[PDB]
Amino acid sequence: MKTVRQERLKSIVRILERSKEPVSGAQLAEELSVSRQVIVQDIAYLRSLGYNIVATPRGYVLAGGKSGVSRLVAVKHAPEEIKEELLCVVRNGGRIVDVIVEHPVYGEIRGIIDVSSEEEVLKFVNLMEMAKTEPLLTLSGGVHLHTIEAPDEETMERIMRELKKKGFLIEE
């Protein structure tokens, strides 16, 4: 059944994310009441969808901390909307890893953001406002990319929906 499987896949992702240590396929099989082989197939499927799962000798590993899935998002906004954009992403369950923006000298520059909570967003903005350099998001008409991570596709989808509602997304 399609629904039975969607439920098992969601559980696998949650179990792997919650766990600090690797979780063996035998344990996932025991915990989900399916054969070891069903787990091998589920994991291959989850990976082809984008889940950053790795099979190590001691078990499957999938980073908790909202880093299950990753995606490049094309957005467009002024430097003053940075806070709004980050809050929109962290409040919806994800994290912003970095920013890529075209530059007239270096082709493109990649900067680090690394925020996954409202407090980190506020520390980033505060930190940014206290600094005295030229803004980067003034470059390229405000067009830039962000690598966004999320616990799962459902969450990633919610994040894209919200960014769209705020008019940040570039769509063509």
Ligand SMILES: [K+]
């Ligand atoms: K984990």
Ligand code: NI
């Ligand atoms: Ni941005």
